[PDB]
Every structure is written in structure tokens, then in C-alpha cells.
Enzyme design. Structure first.
Site, PDB file in Angstrom:
ATOM      1  N   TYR A  20      39.170  42.842  32.084  1.00 43.50           N
ATOM      2  CA  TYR A  20      37.892  42.940  31.355  1.00 43.50           C
ATOM      3  C   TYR A  20      38.036  42.627  29.864  1.00 43.50           C
ATOM      4  O   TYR A  20      38.717  43.329  29.131  1.00 43.50           O
ATOM      5  CB  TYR A  20      37.475  44.410  31.530  1.00 43.50           C
ATOM      6  CG  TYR A  20      36.232  44.794  30.758  1.00 43.50           C
ATOM      7  CD1 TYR A  20      34.981  44.476  31.202  1.00 43.50           C
ATOM      8  CD2 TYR A  20      36.397  45.544  29.579  1.00 43.50           C
ATOM      9  CE1 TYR A  20      33.841  44.840  30.489  1.00 43.50           C
ATOM     10  CE2 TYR A  20      35.263  45.917  28.864  1.00 43.50           C
ATOM     11  CZ  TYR A  20      34.019  45.570  29.332  1.00 43.50           C
ATOM     12  OH  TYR A  20      32.871  45.923  28.653  1.00 43.50           O
ATOM     13  N   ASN A  46      46.059  43.263  29.644  1.00 46.09           N
ATOM     14  CA  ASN A  46      44.896  43.823  28.948  1.00 46.09           C
ATOM     15  C   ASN A  46      44.954  45.357  29.028  1.00 46.09           C
ATOM     16  O   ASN A  46      43.888  45.992  29.092  1.00 46.09           O
ATOM     17  CB  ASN A  46      43.652  43.305  29.677  1.00 46.09           C
ATOM     18  CG  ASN A  46      42.347  43.604  28.952  1.00 46.09           C
ATOM     19  OD1 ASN A  46      42.160  43.270  27.765  1.00 46.09           O
ATOM     20  ND2 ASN A  46      41.382  44.236  29.627  1.00 46.09           N
ATOM     21  N   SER A  74      43.709  47.048  31.937  1.00 46.24           N
ATOM     22  CA  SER A  74      43.995  46.372  33.207  1.00 46.24           C
ATOM     23  C   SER A  74      45.111  45.344  33.090  1.00 46.24           C
ATOM     24  O   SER A  74      45.212  44.710  32.042  1.00 46.24           O
ATOM     25  CB  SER A  74      42.758  45.561  33.693  1.00 46.24           C
ATOM     26  OG  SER A  74      41.772  46.509  34.102  1.00 46.24           O
ATOM     27  N   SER A 132      42.478  51.308  33.955  1.00 41.72           N
ATOM     28  CA  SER A 132      43.232  50.069  34.024  1.00 41.72           C
ATOM     29  C   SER A 132      43.283  49.562  35.463  1.00 41.72           C
ATOM     30  O   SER A 132      43.878  50.236  36.300  1.00 41.72           O
ATOM     31  CB  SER A 132      44.645  50.387  33.507  1.00 41.72           C
ATOM     32  OG  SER A 132      45.326  49.231  33.032  1.00 41.72           O
ATOM     33  N   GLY A 133      42.731  48.379  35.737  1.00 44.03           N
ATOM     34  CA  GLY A 133      42.837  47.813  37.085  1.00 44.03           C
ATOM     35  C   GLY A 133      44.166  47.090  37.236  1.00 44.03           C
ATOM     36  O   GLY A 133      44.289  45.968  36.734  1.00 44.03           O
TER      37      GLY A 133
END
Lengths: 363, 363, 363, 363
Positions: free
Chosen positions: D138, D210, D238, D276-277
Site C-alpha cells: 500500500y 513497505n 507490508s 503489514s501484509g
């Protein structure tokens, strides 16, 4: 016995009172330790093994379900009781840790002990079954593992010894004969307290450390294993992580918390060896409730929002790293007799302190 | 003893031989059956239990890894040894099935038997550990399950009795004291031969059937449970599925095969009860290889393409349904003594045939 | 249009008022159906496809998390948004179902629609991201799927059309060009009311049925496919299941509920084909709460005890089976034009009734 | 542009020629980078985003299945295409990475690009479907994410630009607007060459970083985040990991390899944030075979033994760590315009060197 913080290692935050998994209210730990240095009759190798028992809500007269989550980082090992943890979300009874070939006798002994201890639950007309959580690491380098030294009485002794307060570390319980990063390993524990929504909760960790190779060892970010190369097992010739908390979490949140122990073990250097059975379980002591057969149809539960969890995750990772280091500090040399193939040394405190000093990490 | 096909039930395709899991070459099945009708000294209820052992590559002098896959449909039960099946892809040794509280002694006995039977592998200097697959269903309604009747000697007897050929069904081995759909349950087996890439393979199933309620029972798509309402256990007061094949399948394909047993158990009516420990394992006997410590660094394996698998999936589903029905047909009445709470009856063959005839399904 | 019950098929239990997924309060269903019988410019095949949108809490001015669980029975298909359903436990916004190659435009359109519909949530300074649940089945036999007929406007129309009340079935929405068991397939729905702990709940199912082969077809336990052998697609040359309930369930319980759709699809005969993308999602509308960024740190939730769930599991299975058969009863013949390779017929009602009557299953 | 090794950071082992994921033969990387510093008409914030495409077997005229495995460490993000990776074991086509709300257009554009690029496969009479692997992080802090700046043309440009050789890092492709550890983040890559059984193999990683918060940052084991505290995004107001190898691994083995990226991201300090993905995919380029519909019924595959994998696991962990640090070194300041909320600075090379030198880790 100094612990890692006592030697000046630069650990991480505020701990509970004993800096152990018993800082989580109601959780008790008991050990049975077998250290022999001559073979039993008919065996060629000595028995160095034991059993560790962790019991949540140790005061309750009836088993109390504890919501729980497991993470199988590398499944080359055993941890029973996880099918209903995954689907039902909880387990009852103690977590029992021993050596790989003592799973059976430990499982048998734990069922028998639960039937006796909770007689008002199980010695009734109700149709109930017990599926205990029994796990292991492999001590065959220092223990006569195919001699099956752990008996029913040894496991009952660990269960009957569970208690609150300070926890013994090093060569004790299931950790007795273990080896970590080429040095003597064993049992280690630590805790952290975090504030969450105006209340204070504890995260406690207990590890049975039997993983890693010397070259990988990193302590406080320093590649200690590159500087302390002598006495490795290789030159002479797995990790169970239990996280406990009183934070109100549901199963799907606890599986995430257990997954954080992957980073926790990574902190001391391992990339996760293929032969290492690295299996982590996390449980919460919040949300006390009756067993399924005595519960009302609807239950009211408290659950945390996920937004603020980063500090809880950090605490869990930090407690696992300190529990592993505590095990190495608490361990003592073992082996070196005429019946051994190896002498496993405990990491030397003064040499450790010196290497950390050179890299500016000796507090 | 007639089996289900012998009564005119309208089963499904070509079976191997014996119409049993031993139709998969090299797979042997052994049983130890304990049927007592008076309590052992100090107990109040009789012991009716036992052990079932399934051993692939039963002629081999060394343990041969068999790739496998597990599906936990509803995890309210135990099946050990699945962590390395998930991550490693295979298991070694037998699949042992007993009662819920016999897991521990069966596990202990299996490890001891493997160390003795495969002495040239395990009684060496190699650091090797054993993680057997031991599973269960709950026989507490007919058995004194908290008296722990199954001993080490009982489990060794089942292991030493493994054989090819016809397989005994009904009240034998681990299924001795089991109940299914309110009727007597127990052990059931069936097989199918299929052609794949011209070539002929067998799929065989063995079930320990202890699941379902009378009201749900469907046989040949006929709601038999709505017509045969008497004698249910309820009025008086789990399923392990093992699929074996010689088709060359890898772990990720075997997990899908094991998941097909969900539809297989759905065939006889259950929606999957909450208290039912429904856990399925599928393994292939193809791609024989040495153990990890004796293997070359690269292995050549054969694996099927996925396109033609629907006929294999249908054979798996059909064999699970036939195995469950076979268990009910082979079962005999049990209980009804002065020490029992229930009398569990085997489904009546003539009444069943009559109900099927009324709906045009008696062949 | 008679539905399956109207033809005398012997269905199962008490339905909600509409016998549809909209019987679960606040759940709305919207469709966009594209049925053309001549090719668009530059194409060779006509477009027959569409979009189905299911929106929980359709009145709410802000997106409301709904706890959910998924089961991937055979993953030869796409269902987006499942990573945070597995870890986070819930999803926000609608479930959107379309054809395989329309996933991307449906996903893009759904994000854009959410940003506009929930402007007070998303057009702010908060850092928020949207991960919608978009799924598919493959309508390539009857639709020009590589022509990408579904546009952003088509998906917005489905979303803007969501409504409570009676739900259209058969050739509509994402089900428009689907085929099931060699007959015309499409959209189907059904519901069941159950009593749980002194309270009334509804379980509703919506299916996009595109699976199965004619030979396997079983309706009310009768092997209909062995009797109705003509006009199969083969001779001329996947299933998404959504379960919704107002029962207060947590994520670990909802994954179990979604797994019951495996038996639900097995009821009409499939063994679960290799090429069939059979993916199920179950959600609850209970335990309304704010989004993560607006929630207090602690939430109070209600959760059912697991003991009494068998009647819930049975209702879920029965509702899936009825929704599939409803889809076949509602479907209409499609294809047979000069631009088609096939003519897919809907199952004939009178022939069906006649076969059921011969086996004593026509009510 | 110096990379991390050029500044004296003490990295780990032998790299392939480019020290990038293109060191795995036939793997191409292509980027589309959008950097605008004034808002598009009708928008209030500028667009800074893009697309990264990774294509295995980039020379092939037909799509070649690559076995793969995924690890969802924390599912707060999207990665499409994983259901058939889990059950079928492989994927086809490129891995495409972009921003969270660009998933849908990237998915749609990739399907359309595959239909055109592999026309001899997909524009035929065969019933084939495409389920691409599209992932995201994101970039809402620096990019007008709800303006949907990435178009179909942008994603086609990245796909058409795939190439071997040196790989651009920092503010490019999907990583263009990303932030890591409170410093500018982005795209990073690294590789390692290992010997396994007398053969040489490469492991390459590409990351879109990220994730993390400044206080956690650790570089070479040094707590750099404690020393470089200025300009954090927080004070002003992420991670997708792709591992590629030519080692012959099967799906169950690749799932374990992808799990090792958890330790790889923990090397730089994160405990795994809730928002965080963190989703990781590993694939092998070995064992080339036809697509399912053109394959023979039996395939011959080469698979590694598991015993020697520790050196591969270490190489994987080290390459992920180096890729993350390479992304921070290659990044450039971004933002700070009249339309921004923040100014995100790239980590200063000289200050970083100075902190490392103080702890004896500057090589």
C-alpha cells in the site's frame, strides 16, 4: 546462577516478577530431571533426559479450556493434541515436553494423571475424551533415547511438581540432554509486561532449545558463532516454544501470535534447519469458561482489537530470544565420560562477554 | 460372513481381489481384538477394544518412506505423526488405530517395535528419530476406556500379525467397541481397480467407523435411518479413513485425495458431527526410495498428470462408502450384560434388504 | 416459476420466508445479467455472463466487518480477499461472483464502488485499504470469456441493485452461462431456520453451480444421471458456495461451517472433479462492530458453544443441496445458435418427476 | 549507484553475476514507473506508483508451469492465484506486483496480455482459464491510491519490458511509492549461488519493501533505528517477497522455502506488524513440463533430498535480508511538495556507515 541479564547482555524491556512463564497468573511449571552418568543394566549409554510440564489455571478443580493457536514452522518433530486446537480452538490440561521417543509414555501418563486429578470431571457417566498436548525435542547425542528412560512415574512427578514462582533453567526437565548452536542447551524462560488499553498484561515464554549450528549463532546482533568455534559436536564426531499470555485473544489471533516465534528463533541466527522440529504453541488464560459439556449455549467473550498488537508481537519475539539465551547461560557441561561420543560444553560467560564488548554491545 | 455386495447392495465398480486395502501390493493389516464381558479386577465395566495396524511395504528389511497427505475434516480426535507428513511429505512405519486413551501406549509400543524390527536401521550410530502415525476413535460407551486395557503386548501382537490376503471386518482391532449411526460399527475395508494411462492401479480404503446418528443413515441413497428407528443408544440412556494406492502421487496430490473422503463419509448421511474426530490419511506405495540419511541428493520420481484424476477421485469416494457399509454388515451385537448401560445391535440384514427393495435399490 | 419444492422433490426442513440467502436479515443480493445471441463486433462468439453481488448489512452507512471462514475444497479457481479472512477473521463489503476472466474488472469496480458508497469512511485522511472478495466459475463453453464482456458498469449495476426479498435463480448474474452435471446450471439459493439455545437463527446459501458430469448426478438419493443420458455437452463436442447466518460464530467455527459445504456438494453426486474450482465461504452477520481503526481496544463478543452445532451443520448441508437443485430447476436452455458449439438444455421437470416416482421419492 | 555491498555493509556469501533475481536463468523482470509531482485533473494528490512484473521462462512460446509454494506470514494484503498454487502446486505466467487498489486492473491487464502473448495456447478451441499471481503493497501515504493511477497500458508496458540482466532498484515499478522502516523503501533484489550434490544452483529474491517502523530497524545486527531517529513519517503527521531458484523442488518443499522468508524479514528488525501484509512466494524453474491439457499421463520429475537443504535455507534468508537493505540504499527522497503530507527521506549512506563503524561492522 546469573541469568543473561545478570551478565550485562542488552535485553529488551520490562519483565514480570520472575522473568518467567509463571509470571502469567495461574500458570505453573514442574520438572522431572534424570541425569545418570553410567548405563543402566543392558544399555551401553547413560540416560540424561526428563519431562517438563506447564499447567494453566493450576488451582482449578476442573480442567479449564484455554484458547490456543499453533504454528508448525518446520514439522520434523511431534506435538500432539493440535487437531482440536486448530478446529475447536483450545486445549485442556498441561503442555508436556520430553524427548522424541518418550512421547508415548508421556501421553499415556498424562491421560492417566488427568483422570485421577480431575476425578469429578472424568470418573463419571459423561462421555468425555482427553487429548493432551505432548511435544518433544531429540536428545539422542547425549541420552540413551532408544533405552526409553522416561517412565510413567517420571512424568507424574513432573505434573505433581508444577508450581508458581521462579523457574529452573538449563539442564532440567525435557531440556536436560539438549544441545543448541553447538553448545549445551536446554530449558529457558522469560516474560514481558505490556500495557494495552489501560490494563497491563503479561507475555511469558518457555523454550526447550535443541536447535541451530555453531556457525550461525548471533547474540545481541553479534556473530558470536564466528568467534567461538571450538568444541562443536561435529568436530568430535529442534525447538519447542510455548507462549502464554493473559491478553484476551481468540484462536485466529493466537495462531498469529504463535507465528511470531519464527522471528523469535531467527534472532539468534538459525535459518530454520531441515532436521529441526520447530513447533510453537501460544495460549491465553483469559476468558475462563466451563468445558463444552457444561457450558451454556452462548458464551460472552472479551477480545482485543488488532490495531495495537504490534507491541505484543514485539514482546513475544523478545521473550523468545531471551528464553533461548537464558537456556544457554543456565546450561552446564554434559558428557565426556567413557560412555559418551561427545563432551558438550556450556557457552563460557567470560568469553561471551568479551566478544560482545568488542562490538559495543556489552551493557 | 456375507459382505455388503453379497446381500444385494448396489455397489459401484470393479474391486481388487479381496475387495480390501491389502489389494494394494505389499500393504499388510494386523489386528489385536480384546472382547471381555466381565470387568477386570478393580474395574466396573468390561474391556472391549483393540488395535489395528496397517503396514506398507511389509516385506522390506528397512523402513520405506511412503508419500502421504492428511485431511482434518473435523479435528475432535487424534492422529499423531502428521507434522512431518505435512512438511516432509511422507511417513515411515505403520498406521496404528486404537481407542482414544490408548494413543500413548500404542505410540510407545510402535516406536519400540520399530527399533527392534528395523534393528539394522535404528540400532546404529546414526542419529535417527521415529514419529509414528497413531490414530483413534472413542469406544467409551462399550469399553472401560479409563481402565486403559490396551497394553504394549497387545499393540505388538497387532504389528506382528500383519498379513496380506482377506481382511477381517466388524468387531475387530481398533473398531472392536465402536458404534456407527446408532448401530454396531467397527472396521470396514473395500478397494477399486482403475485404469490410468492404460496402466492398472488399485485404490483401497480401511475405515474405523464410530460416527453418525441413526436419523441420518442413508444406504444406497435410501433414508434407511428414517425406517429403522429402534434400539438407538440415545433411547437407552468419529471416523478414521485410511486410503492406500499404488498410483504415483506426490504429497500435494495426496492431500487432495484424502480430502475426497469428506464426500465419501457424506454418502451414508452424516453432515459431520461436532464431536466426531473425522481425520483422513492417504498414502501411495509408488516411488520407493531410501530414508533421508541414505538417499542420494537428487531423486527421480514419477508423478501423474492431474487431468485424468476424476476416475480416481470417484473410486476413492466409492471405496470409503463401501468400507463404512461393510463395517456395519460385518458387525455383531455387543453389550447388554449386567455391567453395560447399553446393548448395541448390528443392523439387521433382512430388514435392510426389505427397505432397499421398497425403494427399488435392491440388486 | 416453480422451484424444486414446488415439483414435489422431498426437501428437508423449515425454510425462512423466501427460502433464500436474503432470509438472513440485512443481506442483499443484486444481479447484472448479460444474455446476447449474436457476437459483438470483432468477436466470433456471443456473450452470456454477468455478475452476482451479495452485500451483508446493506443498510449500514459504514462497512461492517463480518467474521468469516473459507474452505478451499479444490482450488482450481479464484476467490480473492481470503488472506485477511484467514488471519484477520473477517471481510468488509460484498461477495462478488462472476466469470473467471472477469475477476480483475470486478475487483477494480468493487474497490471503486466502495470508495464512492462509503465516502465518509474512505475519502478521508485515514490510511485504509480495501481487499474485496471476488470469485468466479468458468463460462467458456457458452460465453465469449476471452472477449471480456463484463465491464465496470456491469459490476456497478449488480452492486447498486442489491435488495432483500425473493432472489432470482437460474440464468442470472454470474450464473448466466453456467452448466452443471451436463444440464444448464447457474444461480441457486435456499435457507433453513433452526432453534439454538432458546433462540431462532437462519442459515442461508447461495451457489453459482458450474460443476459435475451427467453420469454422477444424484437427486434425492436417486441416480438420475444414469436415466437421463441425452444431450450432454461431451456428446456434442466449479462451484462457489456462499453460506450466511446470523448465529454468533467466531472465525475458527466459521471455517468448520464452510467445510460442511464439501458434503453439501457431494449430495448431488460429484466426487469433486480435478478441474472444478470448489471454494466455499461462510460468514455471520452477528457481533456487529466498528472497523479496526475506529474500534475500542477491547470488544465484547457472543459465541456459541460447540455442543449443539450438529443441527446447524445439517441445515448448512441441506441448504447447499437445495440451492444446487434449485439452480437446475430455474435454469433455461441456452446456446444452439449458429455461433455456438453446444446447446445446453435445462433438466426436464416431467422426466425428472417420473424417475423420482419410480424409486419412491416423489413426494 | 552503489548497492549495499559497495558501501561496505558486511554481506553474506557468493552472489550470482548481477546479484539479482535475474541470476536465475530465464527469469525476466520488467517495470512501469509513474512519478508525478502534481495532481492529475480532479485529484488533490500526485500519483507515484507503478507495476513490477517477474516472468519465468521468458523465452518460451507457451506458458510453462513452475512449481511454487506460498507462505502467508500476516495476511493483511492481497496476492491472487494462490488457490491452485496450494492444490495444483504451480502457477503460469508472471508474478505482477503493484499498489493495493491496482490489483483489479493489473489482474485484468495480465489475463488480456497472456491471451495475446500466448495466442497459440489460449485463442483455440481448448477450454482453458488463466489465474494470474498479482500482489500488492500500500502506497497511500505518497500516492493518490484512490485515484487509480495504474492503467491497463501501464501494466502491459511492465510485461512487455521484462528483461534479463541488471535489475533496477529503489523507487521503481510497484515499489515506487513505498516506505520501509520510516525511510524511503521500494524494490530490492539479491541472489546467492550454492553448490548442492556436485551441481551449482542459484537462489534469487526480489522484494517490494513497505514494512517496519523506524525504531525497529537493525542493519548488520546493529540497532540503527535507535541512532537515526529523525524525519519519521509519524513525527510529520507490508512486504511481498518473491524467491526464485533453479533447484529441483516440489510444492511441499517450496512451501517450506517460502516460510524461510519470515526469518529473512525479521533480520532487519520487524516483529511482523499487524497492518503489514507479509506474503511470500517461492518458485522453481526446474522440471519444465507441458500444461495439464498437453501433458502425458505420467511425468518424470527430479526432486532434491532434504538432508543438505540447510545451506539453501541460509542462502534464502540472506538474500531476502540483502534485497531489503538494497531497496533502502537504492531509494531516493520523495514527497515534500505542496500537495504532500510528508517528505520521506532515503537513508543517508554516510550516517549509516558511521553508525556501523562504531559497532565494528563496517567492512
Amino acid at each position: 546462577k546469573p541469568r543473561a541479564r545478570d551478565l550485562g547482555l542488552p535485553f529488551t524491556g520490562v519483565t514480570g516478577p520472575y522473568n518467567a512463564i509463571t509470571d502469567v497468573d495461574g500458570v505453573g511449571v514442574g520438572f522431572q530431571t534424570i541425569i545418570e552418568n553410567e548405563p543402566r543394566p543392558g544399555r551401553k549409554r547413560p540416560a540424561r533426559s526428563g519431562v517438563t510440564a506447564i499447567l494453566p489455571h493450576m488451582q482449578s478443580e476442573t480442567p479449564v479450556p484455554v484458547y490456543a493457536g499453533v504454528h508448525r514452522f518446520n514439522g520434523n518433530g511431534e506435538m500432539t493434541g493440535t487437531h482440536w486446537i486448530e478446529d475447536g480452538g483450545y486445549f485442556l490440561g498441561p503442555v508436556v515436553i520430553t524427548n522424541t521417543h518418550g512421547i508415548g509414555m508421556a501421553h499415556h501418563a498424562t491421560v492417566r494423571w488427568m483422570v485421577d486429578r480431575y476425578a469429578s470431571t472424568y470418573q463419571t457417566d459423561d462421555f468425555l475424551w482427553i487429548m493432551p498436548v505432548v511435544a518433544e525435542t531429540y536428545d539422542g547425542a547425549l541420552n540413551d533415547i532408544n533405552g526409553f528412560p522416561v517412565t510413567e512415574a517420571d512424568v507424574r512427578k513432573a505434573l505433581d511438581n508444577v508450581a508458581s514462582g521462579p523457574v529452573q533453567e538449563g539442564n532440567c526437565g525435557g531440556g536436560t540432554g539438549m544441545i543448541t548452536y553447538g553448545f549445551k542447551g536446554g530449558t529457558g524462560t522469560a516474560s514481558r509486561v505490556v500495557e494495552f488499553g489501560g490494563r497491563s498484561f503479561t507475555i511469558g515464554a518457555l523454550v526447550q532449545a535443541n536447535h541451530g549450528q555453531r556457525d550461525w549463532l548471533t547474540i545481541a546482533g553479534v556473530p558470536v558463532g564466528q568467534h567461538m568455534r571450538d568444541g562443536t559436536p561435529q568436530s568430535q564426531l529442534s525447538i519447542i516454544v510455548v507462549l502464554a499470555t493473559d491478553l484476551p485473544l481468540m484462536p485466529h489471533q493466537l495462531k498469529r501470535l504463535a507465528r511470531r516465534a519464527s522471528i523469535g528463533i531467527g534472532r539468534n541466527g538459525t535459518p530454520g534447519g531441515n532436521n529441526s522440529g520447530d513447533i510453537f504453541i501460544a495460549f491465553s488464560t483469559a476468558n475462563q469458561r466451563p468445558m463444552q459439556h457444561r457450558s451454556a449455549p452462548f458464551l460472552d467473550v472479551e477480545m482485543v482489537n488488532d490495531e495495537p498488537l504490534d507491541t505484543v508481537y514485539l514482546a513475544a519475539v523478545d521473550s523468545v530470544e531471551e528464553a533461548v539465551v537464558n537456556a544457554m547461560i543456565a546450561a552446564e557441561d554434559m558428557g565426556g565420560t567413557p560412555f559418551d561420543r561427545l563432551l558438550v560444553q556450556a557457552i563460557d560467560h567470560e568469553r561471551l562477554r568479551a566478544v560482545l564488548r568488542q562490538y559495543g554491545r556489552l551493557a
